[PDB]
Amino acid sequence: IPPIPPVDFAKYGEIEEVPMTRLMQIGATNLHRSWLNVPHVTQFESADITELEAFRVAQKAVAEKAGVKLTVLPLLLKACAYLLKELPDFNSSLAPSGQALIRKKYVHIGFAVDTPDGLLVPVIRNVDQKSLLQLAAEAAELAEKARSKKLGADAMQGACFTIASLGHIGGTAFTPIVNAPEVAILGVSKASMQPVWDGKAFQPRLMLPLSLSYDHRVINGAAAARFTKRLGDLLADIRAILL
Amino acid sequence: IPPIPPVDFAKYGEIEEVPMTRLMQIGATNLHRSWLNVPHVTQFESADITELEAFRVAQKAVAEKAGVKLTVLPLLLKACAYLLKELPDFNSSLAPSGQALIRKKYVHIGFAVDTPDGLLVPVIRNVDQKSLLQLAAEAAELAEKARSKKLGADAMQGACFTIASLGHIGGTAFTPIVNAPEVAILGVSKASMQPVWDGKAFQPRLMLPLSLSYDHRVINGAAAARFTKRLGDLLADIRAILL
């Protein structure tokens, strides 16, 4: 692939060289390898989380009694695990022969933690089997170990899917890059009060922006549209996970 | 125990003798054995099922697609199974030595089916592990087999708890009899719209009457009051089963 021509940046003013941590360099390589290997499409959707939010906030007592903080992330992890089982092509990878998908029968999900040294994506194993306060505890632990460089490379392996949440900082939507060999990554941005037509008038609903990027070789437009539609449906009423 | 004196009923008018099925006679014996063995207390509670009802009715599409009818019974079975795990003394039996409780580490629940021949209480095994549409399917099957005399005595065994629902016929509450060696039975009656004080005014909420009878040798008043309070809490918001 043609390289970018070097420029003498100091011809234009003062420059300074800072170096990249080995973590950034690793990260840089993996993103570039994914970019050139995966033809990316991003499907955008918004989910009504007004009732989910009310639930979160009411269970503040129980979560503190348990010592966990219950954010949107365990609710997101539980719903994507239910969906990764319903729509199995999202829980799979392209076999190196280019002619088979390896469908995984397990659901481990990674989530992006941005640390000073670079991006880490710890993996919670068997998300489909853990409860909201279990995933809350564990997500929190893995993030603290990630920040404190105590995350062992074992916990960075064998994910089937990645959630990347930037809702705590800002933004309306973004187009994340698939962590190949996974086949999809869910970006989540900031929730806002939005007018939503109730058939007769506009009601304020709290809306969560979702950005699903996927590997278009494995997932086609209709399948990905159906995945963010079911996810918006499960987040609007998380009780559907019970049936 | 002193017998009831025989009366010549025909001195007062015409009488007719109909016989009891063997099922009624079995049933008659077991109830009398429980009655004389278990000092019974009934704890009454009401649960707000307005939102549960809305959920039931909205999932009518999914349940029909699955071929199951989703009544209140699978929702009741799922919540009592979660609770039978939280409050383990309800999931136990008095050991024959009179000095130990056998705590069961499994949750199988029976439910009363009134058939022409008599009462049958089929048992769904491992209710804690099945989903609302799974319990819906299975409850329906077991009831049809019960009515059609095809219920094998295997499926009438090893229950930990019994739900007896008469909400489809009527009534405000009743005092059910514990099926010893179990230690409790939940009676459920008809839901009604009821005014419920919202701090400022009376709001109509749909209220489900619950009647928990228990074996007072094993369960004391505070524990049973806490059990129907948690059950009313879980039925008012079934999402708490997710955490």
UniProtKB/Swiss-Prot annotation, chains A, B:
Location of the region described as Catalytic in the Swiss-Prot/TrEMBL record: 1-243
Coiled-coil segments on the chain, per record: none
Active site: H216
Subunit structure: Forms a 24-polypeptide structural core with octahedral symmetry.
Family note: Belongs to the 2-oxoacid dehydrogenase family.
Biological role stated in the UniProt entry: The pyruvate dehydrogenase complex catalyzes the overall conversion of pyruvate to acetyl-CoA and CO(2). It contains multiple copies of three enzymatic components: pyruvate dehydrogenase (E1), dihydrolipoamide acetyltransferase (E2) and lipoamide dehydrogenase (E3).
Protein name, entry field: Dihydrolipoyllysine-residue acetyltransferase component of pyruvate dehydrogenase complex
Residue range from the parent sequence: 396 to 638 of 638
